[PDB]
């Protein structure tokens, strides 16, 4: 067993093609479903495996009422092959209200954050082992991804934050090899709050979209070098603009160096990456609320301050339906690396009232060379016949 | 891990054996078990697997009301080992209301087809990464075997149509390496409408028995040549006929050329496979309704334009039963390779009307050299205890 | 992987150690449990499985209502390792109202028997595939084992018998080679009915101490050759006497030759091996109904003609409690190979009115060379709790 | 595969860090979980296991009513991979009202204690097969650690105890090789009483911080010297003592040698372990009752007799909630093997009387030698949601 090093092109993608869906919403109406939000997909080297932090409890189950809460003690970190939902034999592999969990090809680590808001532990389990752990250092709630971090040659690297959610923010980069933190590197460069990056394997660096909820309706762009561990950040280009709230594209604005200052406040994770000077991308249809959600190029998108020509556009779930996070995962290819993305459906309280719980169910679709046609492909359950 | 190449001769048989029954329906009066239609069975090289495309619910959950209809989003290919049922804890390998999965040796490929009726996408994925996609060529619904594929030396066929249901269609033949088309090839020789193929090894081809849908009741044979990609396509000699609306036997025909124009329209997935000029069948009991299921062996069935000798007939599930699609599977043996079958059983509406949702279960029987004697298995619910 | 040939002395044994129990009724009351009789558990070279006839139900069912039949289409063979319970994500491994198991050091064996009575085939699956079948030879109800059959250097003997159940019946004993039936030999010697064989490796034979029907209340012994694929026959000395019904042991006698005719008709399944001259059995402790079991040793007990000394006996279920069938199983220890049993606990109908359903469930002991106290235990449901 | 022989040094740890919970009670009032107490995690080489003690039963299941009693024909002992909660699924591996496992690098070995209370037989199971047995030396109530035995070389070690609970009683230390005893040490030294040793590999010998049910609040250390099989024990220096009942830190005593005879009777399964002169320890924060728990170094506490100086607390469940037993087991690191531990949080009767059951739920933390923070994780089950 060998190192992943993710040395080769990502691959050139025409679009996105179906992946999975898991449909726990649907299911929860007639079977014992884990309550869950925040879910994840990554993937080791044979096969891909679904996450998310549960509620600690099934739907139809008394304690399910008033889920809508982040951090409760009682949050684990679910993990299931990619496909099956999470149905009552599923492992809470560690206590986590927030994590991020990645392969380095010979063994997965998780990071998992619990405990109190204003003085939290993550612990680093890799290869089943508790390794090491870090303390809150701004007393202001640990987080992290919510989605996967990645490893080349035995470094994993993850990215997480502690201070204001909406002012200004302590964020580190750290590296970790088998489990121990081997070093840790402040953010730099211009990205004024980062929440919740979505990385991935761009040999030989790692780069991140991530979520501004203080300024920014632009999303701010993580750089970290592998080598040297040094961090670099900025804005992405594209005037088209990806976090929720947003302007709309009339009047929304990047200049890849500073927040828009458009709709800053607030956010939502999602994910972005890049083809030349191209970028590829999704976010949710509605500029206000987290529903809908559509991809596509916008040609310059990379590279050139405020470029707004967008192609290539196709829905995942129609602008009627609620959608949620989105993050993006990398598969190794035979010829090239791919990249991929879930979508969070999320269900319940608060939007929808008729129910006291909030769950969420997926939805992931991955890169294709190939053709595509049309579709929306939403969570499904119908509200009236769900266990309130 | 070496390429399946199927290069072993037909065993000899003397009828069929039982073999699996999962028996999903009784079961969900009392379980969670997910709904299901278009099943089939697919086995790697050690062991088995049952497949079914769900409606993305159980069968006691309000949203099971209305499943009758064969294509929404939330449909996804389930995969078990042969007998466990899908219950809450199987795996949606891929989003789906058309599959055709197969096993090459190395890795299993399922192509999955998902989207909007005019315009749906078919994703290739083969050992776990997403490989290719390609969109509706016809613009009205691509549609697929809903069986097994068969890979010889690595490459794996699977024959897909877009186009009429009842007219004429656009049916191509598709080669594909490790998940990646590389090649395909229309319809050439004689059938007129080509749905669902019940395909098998025929070393070195590949051989199968399909619906059409438009004007017969005899079923068309699609020939494909592994090596030139050619592919010809005639219908079954046997007088006997295996589609459902059929004629009668007294009033029945076939000539091995055309669509026999006797109750044309309509069909049900069916399978049947030569032994040098006899033809080994299985076909419903009824003539016009979905009920019972025979299988036999027609003396000349395979080359003789009309032979209606029968020998060897054994019923599988009584007259008085209901039954639905089947298809065939090649198991290879010790010496031979085998030829098995499973006959969905369904269940629900439109047929029965005391519950609103529609389901299968499955039982299956294998070649078998030995002897044998009598019985019938059919679904063995009792409609009047089920949820409805 | 190489063939297990059980060359290794018998392991001297001092009594029995307690070794397993699933506890399947009381988990019913709260649980989707399977509903099953005819248990029995076989063991593979590294771990060991429990199986058992399914009725193709749970027990929170409305199916599970006249349950009490012995043979139905829906009845399949469940699989699992010893300790899970069936639960609804077990595995059916075949169709079968009548079965047998055995691993030969390289792959699974099952016999399993279904079909009309009156023209019943048995599938012999093998590593599984389908590998050959029978059918029934004397046309009434072709039966066999229901607990393990043992395999030597590559080939499994399975005994089989189709008859009367209460008057002369045709019994063969089959010799199989890789699933593939390699030879047929008739009874021989004095047994006169043969039903329920628990038979276990005596290097370089097989002995089995089977249910006798018709005449008898003392137990036939089979004995098969395995080089010569001769058959003898006999009764086990011991004037104790392990079948149900009996005389009690005032008056109850065996010749080791000829039944002893004392409350012949009917029985149920039982074991009992040799040590020397003596011999290790079980039997329930009731002599006219299937309540309580007890192992002993009885000095002499398999040589000398009418032997009753009585030592080392050891209740296992208390007589105020139900038991059943039960039956032998032999694992390889280090040295030697050791003998262990299973007993059945039915629950149900016909003996327990409150309910509609007849279910089973197992407790199983191991031979020890230590020590051991005592105890009983019992199924443990309260009948009055059950869903009926 | 090699044996274990844990020569590594304990890890240098600053505190402990989340490692688990399985929120098996909130689970149980919306999915069929097993009812359960003394539970414990033992861990093979590459992964953790839980197990527990169930009480044949589901929580939402008429037989839980009345399962306060700790010794009934119908306990098993279940194991899952941790985190994965005791669902219907779950394996029985053995039969017990008393156990111990552990893992010797080749196979788990499992003691099992079932049987009548005055004449108990203990089976050792070892890879599968039953391999010895013992029966009860003083015919009152055998029973052993409730949480992992340790292996070194091969050798496995065990403490097992029969006598009076609250009175002298007899102890035995068995060193068993691959299931078999191979020799037995009786207890030496100073201790009064033994019951639920927590032991863990202190290379070379083992060291156990157990229970004393009669004279003290402080606990006993047991002395295993794995290669004379000499015993020796004493009482944990500390003055701040780990029982409960307890006096309270202001009039608590310990001289390292007797029991301190400060409300000695009853007492609660704990683990404490030694650094240096140091002690870690955790006990339960009430001095009354089974409430919360908390975790400190005493510095001096191993060596210096009644030294009181605290540093490093940590609560893990406050003062407001319910703990119960507790234990500790070590997983090999990369470069020296660190310390866990495991709390039991058990509910229901007799303390909580809205319901008729009695189950626990588990939380478990590991060593670090990281920095963390500060938190409180409980059962989390809203007794008024409960089934009762
Ligand atoms: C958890 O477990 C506990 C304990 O579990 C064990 O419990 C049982 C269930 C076992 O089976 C095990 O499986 C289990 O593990 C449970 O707690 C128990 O729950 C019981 C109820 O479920 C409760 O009540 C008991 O239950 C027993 C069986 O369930 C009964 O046998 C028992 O009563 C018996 O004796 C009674 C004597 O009076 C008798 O009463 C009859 O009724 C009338 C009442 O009016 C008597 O007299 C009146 O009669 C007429 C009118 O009809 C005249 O009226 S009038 O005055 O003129 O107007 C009479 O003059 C008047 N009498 C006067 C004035 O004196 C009548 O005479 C009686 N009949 C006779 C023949 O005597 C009754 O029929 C029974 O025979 C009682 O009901 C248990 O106490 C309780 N125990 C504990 C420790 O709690 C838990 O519930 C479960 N539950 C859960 C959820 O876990
Ligand atoms: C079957 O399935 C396939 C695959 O899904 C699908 O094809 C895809 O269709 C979409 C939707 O049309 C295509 O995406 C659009 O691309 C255009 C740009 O392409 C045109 O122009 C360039 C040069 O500019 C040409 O090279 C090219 O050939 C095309 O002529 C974008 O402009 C589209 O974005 C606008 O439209 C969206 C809605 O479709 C808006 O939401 C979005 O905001 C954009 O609108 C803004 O700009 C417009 C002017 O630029 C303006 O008019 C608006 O008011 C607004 O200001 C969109 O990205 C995608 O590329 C196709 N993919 C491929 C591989 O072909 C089929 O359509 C589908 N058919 C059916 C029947 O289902
Ligand atoms: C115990 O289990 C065994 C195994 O299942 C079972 O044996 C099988 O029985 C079936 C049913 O009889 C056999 O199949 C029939 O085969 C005949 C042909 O065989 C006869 O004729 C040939 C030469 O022609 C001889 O070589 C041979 O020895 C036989 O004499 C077919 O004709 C049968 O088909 C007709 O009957 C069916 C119903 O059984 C109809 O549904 C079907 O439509 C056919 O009918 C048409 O043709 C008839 C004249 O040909 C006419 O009379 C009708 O009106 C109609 O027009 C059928 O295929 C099978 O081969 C046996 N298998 C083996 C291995 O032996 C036992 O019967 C069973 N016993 C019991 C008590 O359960
Ligand atoms: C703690 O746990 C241990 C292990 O379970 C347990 O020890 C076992 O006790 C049983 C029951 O006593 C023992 O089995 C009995 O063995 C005697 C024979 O042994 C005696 O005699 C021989 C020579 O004959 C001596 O060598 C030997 O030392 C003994 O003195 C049998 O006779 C017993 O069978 C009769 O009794 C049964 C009930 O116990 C009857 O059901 C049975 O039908 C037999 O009765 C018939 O014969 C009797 C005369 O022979 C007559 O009196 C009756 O009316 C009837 O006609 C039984 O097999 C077993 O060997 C012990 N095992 C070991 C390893 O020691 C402890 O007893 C237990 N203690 C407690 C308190 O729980
Ligand atoms: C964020 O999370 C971190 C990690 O959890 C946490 O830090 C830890 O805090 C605890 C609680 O304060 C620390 O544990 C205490 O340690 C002191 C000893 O340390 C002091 O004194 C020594 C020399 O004596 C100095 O070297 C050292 O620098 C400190 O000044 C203990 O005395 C504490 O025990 C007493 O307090 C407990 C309650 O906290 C009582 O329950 C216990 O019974 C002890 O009380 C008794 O003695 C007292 C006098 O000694 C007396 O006043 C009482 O009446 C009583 O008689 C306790 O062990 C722990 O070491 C910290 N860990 C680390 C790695 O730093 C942060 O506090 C947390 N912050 C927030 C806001 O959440
Ligand atoms: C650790 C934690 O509470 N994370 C939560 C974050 C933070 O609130 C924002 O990042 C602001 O800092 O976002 C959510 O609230 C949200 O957007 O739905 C969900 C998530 O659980
Ligand atoms: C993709 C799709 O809808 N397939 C459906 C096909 C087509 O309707 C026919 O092939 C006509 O084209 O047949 C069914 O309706 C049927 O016979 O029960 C079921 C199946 O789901
Ligand atoms: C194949 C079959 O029906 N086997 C059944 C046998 C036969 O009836 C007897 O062997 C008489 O032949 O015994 C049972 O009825 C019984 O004793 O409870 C159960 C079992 O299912
Ligand atoms: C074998 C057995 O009954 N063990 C029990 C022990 C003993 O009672 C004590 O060790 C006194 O000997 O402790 C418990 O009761 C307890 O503390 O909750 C639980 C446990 O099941
Ligand atoms: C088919 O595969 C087998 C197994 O690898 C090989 O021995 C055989 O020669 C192959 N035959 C052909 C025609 O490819
Ligand atoms: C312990 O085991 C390791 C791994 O096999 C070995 O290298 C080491 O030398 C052993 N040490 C002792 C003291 O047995
Ligand atoms: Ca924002
Ligand atoms: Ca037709
Ligand atoms: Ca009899
Ligand atoms: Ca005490």
Redesign the interface.
């Known amino acids: 067993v060998e190192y992943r090093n993710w040395s080769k092109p990502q691959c050139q993608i025409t679009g996105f ?7 726990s919403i ?2 929860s ?5 884990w309550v869950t939000r925040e879910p994840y997909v990554s993937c080791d080297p ?3 495996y679904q996450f998310a932090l549960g509620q ?9 009422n008033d889920t809508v809460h982040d951090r ?3 949050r ?1 970190l679910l993990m299931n ?1 990619l ?3 999470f ?9 986590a209200w927030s994590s991020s969990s990645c392969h380095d090809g010979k063994a997965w680590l998780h990071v ?1 954050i ?3 808001d ?4 993550a ?3 890799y ?10 250092w701004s007393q202001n709630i ?1 987080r992290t991804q919510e989605s996967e971090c990645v490893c080349i040659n035995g470094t994993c690297t993850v990215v997480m934050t502690d201070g204001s959610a909406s002012g200004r923010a302590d964020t580190r980069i750290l590296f970790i090899e ?1 489990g121990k ?1 081997v070093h840790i590197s402040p953010l730099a460069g211009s990205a004024q709050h980062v929440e919740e990056c979505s990385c991935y394997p761009r040999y030989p660096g790692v780069r991140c979209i991530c979520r501004d909820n203080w300024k920014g309706s632009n999303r701010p762009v993580v750089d970290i070098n592998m080598e040297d561990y040094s961090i670099d950040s900025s804005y992405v280009c594209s005037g088209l603009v990806g976090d929720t709230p947003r302007n709309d594209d009339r009047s929304s604005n990047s200049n890849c160096r500073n927040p828009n200052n458009e709709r800053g406040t607030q956010g939502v994770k999602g994910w972005a990456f890049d083809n030349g000077n191209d970028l590829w991308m999704g976010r949710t249809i509605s500029k206000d609320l987290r529903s809908g959600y559509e991809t596509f190029k916008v040609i310059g998108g990379w590279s050139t301050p405020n470029s707004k020509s967008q192609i290539n556009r196709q829905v995942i779930v129609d602008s009627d339906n609620r959608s949620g996070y989105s993050g993006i995962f990398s ?1 190794e ?2 010829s090239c690396i ?1 990249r ?1 993305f879930y979508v969070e459906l999320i269900r319940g309280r608060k939007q929808e009232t008729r129910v006291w719980w909030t769950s969420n169910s997926i ?1 992931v679709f ?13 969570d ?3 509200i009236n ?1 769900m266990p309130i």
Not at 29 to 33: L, M, R, S
Not at 118 to 121: G, I, L, V
């Open positions: 093609a179906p992946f999975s869906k898991d449909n649907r299911l109406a007639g079977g014992d479903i044979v096969k891909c600690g409890t099934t739907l139809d189950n008394k304690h399910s409760i003690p009682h684990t092959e496909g099956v939902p149905h009552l034999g599923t492992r809470q592999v560690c206590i998992c619990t405990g109190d204003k003085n939290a532990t612990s680093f389990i290869d089943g082992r508790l390794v090491d752990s870090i303390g809150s640990l088998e933190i598969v290819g035979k791919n991929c939805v991955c890169g294709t060379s190939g053709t595509y046609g049309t579709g929306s492909w939403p499904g359950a119908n016949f």
